[PDB]
Amino acid sequence: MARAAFLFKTVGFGGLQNVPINDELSSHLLRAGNSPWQLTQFLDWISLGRGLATSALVPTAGSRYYQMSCLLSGTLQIPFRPNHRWGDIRFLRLVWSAPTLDGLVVAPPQVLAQPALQAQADRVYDCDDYPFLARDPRFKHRVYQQLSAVTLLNLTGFGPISYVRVDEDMWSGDVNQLLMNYFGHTFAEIAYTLCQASANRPWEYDGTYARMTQIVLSLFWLSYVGVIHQQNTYRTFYFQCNRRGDAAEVWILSCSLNHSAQIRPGNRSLFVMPTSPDWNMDVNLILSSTLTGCLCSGSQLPLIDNNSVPAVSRNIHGWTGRAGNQLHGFQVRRMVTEFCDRLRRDGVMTQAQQNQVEALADQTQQFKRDKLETWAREDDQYNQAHPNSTMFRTKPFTNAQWGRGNTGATSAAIAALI
Amino acid sequence: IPVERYNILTNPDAPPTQIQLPEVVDLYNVVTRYAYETPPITAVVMGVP
Amino acid sequence: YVRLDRDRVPTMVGVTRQSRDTITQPALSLSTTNTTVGVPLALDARAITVALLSGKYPPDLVTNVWYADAIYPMYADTEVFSNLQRDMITCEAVQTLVTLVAQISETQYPVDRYLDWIPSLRASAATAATFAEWVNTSMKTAFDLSDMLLEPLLSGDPRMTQLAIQYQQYNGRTFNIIPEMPGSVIADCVQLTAEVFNHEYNLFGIARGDIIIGRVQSTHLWSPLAPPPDLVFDRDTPGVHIFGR
Amino acid sequence: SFRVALAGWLYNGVVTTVIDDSSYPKDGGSVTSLENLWDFFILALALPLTTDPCAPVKAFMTLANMMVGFETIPMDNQIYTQSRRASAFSTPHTWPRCFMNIQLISPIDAPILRQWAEIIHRYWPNPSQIRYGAPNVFGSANLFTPP
Amino acid sequence: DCRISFGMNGAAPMIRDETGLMVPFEGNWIFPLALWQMNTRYFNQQFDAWIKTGELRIRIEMGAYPYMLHYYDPRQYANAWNLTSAWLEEITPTSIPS
Amino acid sequence: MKRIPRKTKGKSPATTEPGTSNREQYKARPGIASVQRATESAEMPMKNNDEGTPDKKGNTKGDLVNEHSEAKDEADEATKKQAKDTDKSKAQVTYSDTGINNANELSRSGNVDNEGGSNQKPMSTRIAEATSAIVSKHPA
Amino acid sequence: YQCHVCSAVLFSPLDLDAHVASHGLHIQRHITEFISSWQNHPIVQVSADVENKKTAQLLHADTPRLVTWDAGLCTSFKIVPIVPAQVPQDVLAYTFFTSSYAIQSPFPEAAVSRIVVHTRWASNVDFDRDSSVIMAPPTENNIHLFKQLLNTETLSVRGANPLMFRANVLHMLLEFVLDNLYLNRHTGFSQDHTPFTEGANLRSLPGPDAEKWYSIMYPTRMGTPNVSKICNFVASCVRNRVGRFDRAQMMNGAMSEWVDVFETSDALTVSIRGRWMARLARMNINPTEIEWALTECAQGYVTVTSPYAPSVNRLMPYRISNAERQISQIIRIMNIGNNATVIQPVLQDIS
Amino acid sequence: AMSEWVDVFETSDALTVSIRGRWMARLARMNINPTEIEWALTECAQGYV
């Protein structure tokens, strides 16, 4: 139902003594304006696929997402102090403008003369403590989108989290007729538009918007795994990928008429997340996580089991509980093989095509592995050189995460959902 | 006045999207209005070295 | 194309209108009446030989530049999209035509009938042709077309089931291609409208049943369109006399 | 004619392109005439570019007609002889046994004709295929061929 | 295989490298001559401003070329943007000037 | 709300960023204008061959010409048109008088109707005569 | 001026907005726009129908008109009075502090009323399909509707042969469907504060004097001042189901993308329009597919780019099936009919 | 195209129908097709035509 508690969690130190952000990155982040509550500050629109966006200070989309989460974690420390002022202290030479947190600006000279603010690492804050934010209901809905997104990123040391739900009651009224309008579009475009639309006005659960976004997420994840395809469709709908396993994948919604699957009645759901560091170069997973955060902004999803998250991420009043659903992790290289196996068994794809798909996937994985390791080591030398401006351009990862995890179990669970 | 042709108003426990075809044609229903965009086909042609 | 394999050369190409599970009049298409596979066309050998013997490239040719400059103006005037839309319209029109004709002819097409209580006759080729011509003009004016649409079908027994094409080898083998019809939204809507008409005939000005002519004089104010049961007799009423030709 | 033949390559199903009968040697021709020899040369180089499937048979039979009175080849029935005009061989049922099976031509009686038949059988051009269009988006309208 | 993606809502435009990454309009680039020659007008319009004022440096691979000299007095201000822009704008897909 | 007329009738701060100048002069080969003129003729739709089909009242359209001779006449028109397009007395490419013997060829014409009979008398006329043979009048 | 999306060069500020409208950022006669990268010769294509071509290429194809819009009511049955009558009444008008308002009625006030078929009797359309089916009231003669197909050698102008009734009815139904093939259009609303329907958002049809249409659209708006059959019918109805019911979350400016509204209509036409919309929606494509198709067709000699902005309310119906293409090709082959005049221009033109 | 032949019920005479039937049978016995004509002409012309 409607969410009753609004809480969020900040980012944690990766062994440093401060938030892994500095003045240069903070200044370079603000490209769409002085407001950190805009979608362009988080994402970008390539509009043609077939490419990876990179920069000197922002190597990857995951890099941008992590840096923005760090910036928000650092800046929100100020207004949530018990004194509740918003411009009497500075964080890395930035201050808030106006009590409604409209924008971030360079600090005044006297604030600059005053000492900066020391920020703790893993803090959980409630949105109702701030007087203005508690007083204005329309105000919360605009910022809780980003708050939910950063919380879903910072809950676990692995990649972002998504939500998958299968149910037949969602197809209640003219939802089928309305979804029939999305046939020609791509998943990235649909997700971008839906993420933008969420902030226009408050919406209620069980609404057409919520049912649409849940159905779209479920369809995308089922097609990604391979449960539903051209010869096995979920009410004639299925997502098709032009070349599986490529560096930049394009998924397009599509219709197949006579072939349709059988779905048992009831309500089923789970959570999924990628564990390989490869997710930093895949926009689709990030978009799905952002859409899940938008959904969480207005709805109350089932809680998350404590034992599936680190100790600091336990017993959040609205996110984690004593007994909850497990988190399912995977790696893209193994998911490609699972997809190919299911399609070959169903007869859509042949052995030779599977062979080319596997080879291309291996090449892509090697390329991304090399690039990520190079950028990580470069960050290491920069941190060694400068001891007062420590920073991370990308979320830290370990060598262990590069291997197979629970991919088979998660694929089996997703297949069991249908 | 035939009440059966105004079911969604007369009937107190009918879903707002119920029709009674082909036996009875109702005269009060739910209509969906749209506004699409139809752009022309645009292309930029680049030469190959 | 077959180099010198005589047993596999093509000889005849034809088009058929009837389904494969029926026996009908053999009505071959006009294309089969050619001695060659297609319409003959003569050429001059001297020009071809001269062209083969005397040709040259420009002294400064770059294929990339030449073909870019040749492709760019050509593709700026394409019509493939309009052609695709016209193709969809044509397929819809053919399906609706066969569906409608099956309801007034003796065609064995498996479609449910809803207006069989309305009197009619067993139409022949000319009657079906006139009806189909009216349908053609109706759809053409509805979709603002001006060029051909189903005109070739309106020449000889428009009563048809499904279109197919064939060609024949010299040794006697034949190859037959039968496209798979996906469906017609217009035909489905027409069927739904007929189903509704089956119950809403009065709103369209049509009355169902029979009439009784006889003198009734009274001051009662019952409507003649809802007569009392005391004034109606049927084929089972005792004393009634039934007449034939 | 050259460009028309190139265009007609694409419409084999409905249009058949053949060499006009006026391009053949007059009255069958003879190997004792320089003009007839040049006629045969021009026709031989022009024939392989058409879509007519009887072109090899016509190419063989024009020389067979021109060589009458000097060389002889066997024939199937008594009705048709070596003097039948090459233009008439327009249908596959008219292909002679001597052309179909080279062994029937004796090198003693028809040396030049044997070589000509062998050349036709061994060096006539071979057909091939190519890819075109975007079937995934636009679709295809091919009927007897892959899309 | 060069593709240019326009920027939106303050983002910067990007072009595709041969490795497969998309990069902004800054840094050091290496261009074969034929690429600019075949995409003259588009490349001029998209790159001249960043070359003149930004931080973009491009190495054009040519092999051999004729050159022209213009001598200037060293005690006064002097700029070569007019000459360079003229050269860049009169490059054409079938010829180049000195 | 802008109406679309029907085709047919039915029922009833500085500016001027650098690099925007136009000083390039490139002569395309082949020329643009030459290519467009050729492609305009190619994209023409095909002719309507409605001969032999019924009409609004059910009468077959077209002239009364024999099936065989109709094809031969159409062949002569194509050659005559082909010669004009090449601006020659005759055309090298001819659709008529080839070496092939197409004696059995047939082409559509208005001589025959859908039932397979002759059109010596219009179909509408035939119906009127048949139905008039059964007319009865008032008694004196 | 210049567009930084396609590198086109423009002269006036309004031209920039008109151009970016094509790219999707916030003249209609154009249907195809191509721009090269090694020269300054853009090419635009318009319909061959234009009265004056301002140096633009022509679309010679006979394209059908698929997308049409209607802003009127989605109904095809109307109630007409047959025998008029006037009855004395006790309540005459509504009075506010010093003003008076007349009492409008949703239904005709007469001795008898009947339902009559009339396609698009209340509709505003940009394009007219021109296949209307219209019936006079049953008092007048309607025999002409059943004698259009083969009643040509009839022996009486008044009347029809009972042997062609099925054909006539089938043609009438086909006309009905063909004329009702349309798409509904979104219009503006207004917030009403009438005591009977308070706070409801009611549509406003385009043009002036729309206030008359409210009584026809929403029967429940009228109160129950007198005692009559109409008043009893109104009193036996619920009040909440009126006007706007639901709206899209995506917004263009301050206007919703789509809306669900309670209003007068008929379910037959509603279903027909829904099926038509589904059929068109199953044909939508995106510019990336066009890029891929054109690049593949070019055989690797040029590359094609089509930049665009994210949206979910654009319709580009161009996707069909190989079976449909084959059927059309078979029809085209049948069209030849052994007529060399049909085939000669094609060979000459490609030559 | 024209139907090759048809059979009809109509007022007629049995004797006349019989006479026409024998006449048609006699004429049909003499029918030849172009292939035999071509073969006979070639054989008579001895291959010179």
d(CA G192, CA D131): 64
Are the beta carbons of A200 and G291 separated by less than 8 Å? no
Residue in C41, C142, C154 nearest the CB of F53: C154
E42 at interface of B, judged by CB pairs closer than 8 A: yes
Q: State how far Cα D24 lies from the chain centre.
A: 12
Q: State how far Cα G301 lies from the chain centre.
A: 42
B12 at interface of G, judged by CB pairs closer than 8 A: yes
Q: Which long-range contacts link F82-90 to residues 24+ away (Cβ below 8 Å)?
A: F82/G344, F82/G348, F85/G348
B16 at interface of C, judged by CB pairs closer than 8 A: no
Asked if A295 contacts A214 with a C-beta cutoff of 8 angstroms, the reply is yes
* Residue A382 CB neighbour total at 10 angstroms: 15
SS3 C54: coil
Query: In terms of DSSP bridges, do strands E4-5 and E14-16 run parallel, antiparallel, or are they unpaired?
Result: antiparallel
Angle A275-A279-A283 from CA coordinates, rounded to 5°: 145
Choose from G306, G331, G351 for mutation: most chain D CBs within 10 A: G351
CB within 8 Å of chain C, chain F residues 23-52: 28-30, 32, 35-36, 39-40, 43, 45-46, 48-50, 52
d(CA A183, CA G68): 20
Kindly report the nearest CA distance between residue A114 and chain B, in angstroms: 55
Are the beta carbons of E93 and B48 separated by less than 8 Å? no
How far apart are the two ends of chain B, measured CA to CA in Å? 77
E38 at interface of C, judged by CB pairs closer than 8 A: yes
Which amino acid, D4?
V
G31 at interface of A, judged by CB pairs closer than 8 A: no
Are the beta carbons of F24 and E48 separated by less than 8 Å? no
D120: which 2 tokens? 């036709």
Kindly report the nearest CA distance between residue C126 and chain F, in angstroms: 6
Kindly report the nearest CA distance between residue B1 and chain G, in angstroms: 7
Nearest CA in chain F to G335: F49
d(CA C165, CA C224): 58
d(CA D137, CA A121): 52
Angle B30-B31-B37 from CA coordinates, rounded to 5°: 155
- If residue G243 lies in a helix (H) or strand (E), which one and from where to where? strand G243-247
Say what the alpha-carbon torsion angle G55, G56, G58, G63 is, to the nearest 10 degrees. -140
G272: which 2 tokens? 């027909």
Asked if A411 contacts A342 with a C-beta cutoff of 8 angstroms, the reply is no
- If residue C137 lies in a helix (H) or strand (E), which one and from where to where? helix C125-142
How far apart are the two ends of chain E, measured CA to CA in Å? 28
* Residue D108 CB neighbour total at 10 angstroms: 7
Choose from D78, D82, D83 for mutation: most chain H CBs within 10 A: D83
* Residue G111 CB neighbour total at 10 angstroms: 10
Are the beta carbons of D81 and H48 separated by less than 8 Å? no
Kindly report the nearest CA distance between residue G249 and chain C, in angstroms: 30
Instruction: Give Cβ neighbours of residue A46 (< 8 Å, ≥ 6 apart).
Output: A53, A248, A283, E5, E22
Cα separation values, G33 from A286, C76, G287, G300, H45, Å = 35, 8, 13, 21, 69
A208 at interface of G, judged by CB pairs closer than 8 A: yes
Asked if F25 contacts G147 with a C-beta cutoff of 8 angstroms, the reply is no
Are the beta carbons of F23 and E90 separated by less than 8 Å? yes
d(CA A175, CA A212): 7
SS3 A26: helix
Question: Which residue shows structure tokens 């009274």?
Answer: C218
SS3 G184: strand
Touch between chain H and chain A (3+ CB pairs, < 8 Å)? no
Which residues of chain C lie closer than 8 angstroms to G278, CB-CB? 185
Are the beta carbons of C68 and E38 separated by less than 8 Å? yes
F109 at interface of G, judged by CB pairs closer than 8 A: no
DSSP letter (8 states) at residue E55 = S
- Closest by alpha carbon to A159, among A388, A355, A327? A327
Are the beta carbons of C44 and D45 separated by less than 8 Å? no
Neighboring chains of D (3 or more beta-carbon pairs < 8 A): C, F, G, H
Question: Which residue shows structure tokens 């009403």?
Answer: G192
Size of interface E-G (CB pairs under 8 A): 27
Residue C208 phi, psi dihedral angles, 5° rounding: -110, 145
Query: In terms of DSSP bridges, do strands C164-169 and C10-16 run parallel, antiparallel, or are they unpaired?
Result: antiparallel
Rg (CA), chain G: 28
Are the beta carbons of G305 and E42 separated by less than 8 Å? no
Cα separation values, B1 from C14, C16, G227, Å = 61, 55, 14
Asked if A312 contacts A241 with a C-beta cutoff of 8 angstroms, the reply is no
- How many residues belong to chain H? 49
SS3 G114: strand
A176 at interface of G, judged by CB pairs closer than 8 A: no
- Closest by alpha carbon to D21, among F96, G35, B14, C47? F96
- If residue A225 lies in a helix (H) or strand (E), which one and from where to where? helix A208-225
Choose from B10, B45, B46 for mutation: most chain G CBs within 10 A: B45
Size of interface C-G (CB pairs under 8 A): 211
Q: What is the DSSP string of G120-181?
A: TSS--BSS------B---TTS--GGGGSSSSTTS-S-SSS--TTSHHHHHHHHHHHHHHHH-
Cα separation values, G5 from A7, A109, B43, C23, G16, Å = 42, 42, 11, 63, 11
Asked if E98 contacts E67 with a C-beta cutoff of 8 angstroms, the reply is yes
Are the beta carbons of C66 and F101 separated by less than 8 Å? no
Neighboring chains of H (3 or more beta-carbon pairs < 8 A): D, F
d(CA A164, CA A223): 12
Kindly report the nearest CA distance between residue A271 and chain G, in angstroms: 26
Asked if C81 contacts D57 with a C-beta cutoff of 8 angstroms, the reply is no
Size of interface A-E (CB pairs under 8 A): 45
How far apart are the two ends of chain H, measured CA to CA in Å? 35
C64: which 2 tokens? 């990339």
Instruction: Print burial letters for C18-53: b (CB count within 10 Å at least 16), e (below 16).
Output: bbeeeeeeeeebbbbbbebbbbbbbbbbebbbeeee
Which residues of chain E lie closer than 8 angstroms to F19, CB-CB? 44-49, 85, 88-89
The answer to whether the peptide bond before residue F30 is cis (omega within 30 degrees of 0) is yes
Asked if C14 contacts C32 with a C-beta cutoff of 8 angstroms, the reply is yes
The answer for F47, left when phi > 0, alpha when psi is -120 to 50, beta otherwise, is beta
B4 at interface of G, judged by CB pairs closer than 8 A: no
Resolution number, Å = 3.0
G144: which 2 tokens? 């002409």
E94 at interface of C, judged by CB pairs closer than 8 A: yes
Choose from A40, A179, A182, A189 for mutation: most chain G CBs within 10 A: A189
Q: State how far Cα C59 lies from the chain centre.
A: 56
SS3 A137: helix
Asked if D90 contacts F99 with a C-beta cutoff of 8 angstroms, the reply is yes
Instruction: Give Cβ neighbours of residue G259 (< 8 Å, ≥ 6 apart).
Output: B32, B33, G186, G244, G246, G247, G248
Residue in F24, F28, F95 nearest the CB of G344: F95
Which residues of chain G lie closer than 8 angstroms to E38, CB-CB? 37-38
Query: In terms of DSSP bridges, do strands G93-95 and G243-247 run parallel, antiparallel, or are they unpaired?
Result: unpaired
Touch between chain B and chain E (3+ CB pairs, < 8 Å)? yes
Instruction: Print burial letters for G19-50: b (CB count within 10 Å at least 16), e (below 16).
Output: bbebbbeeeeebbbbbbbbbbeeebbbbbeee
The answer for A235, left when phi > 0, alpha when psi is -120 to 50, beta otherwise, is left
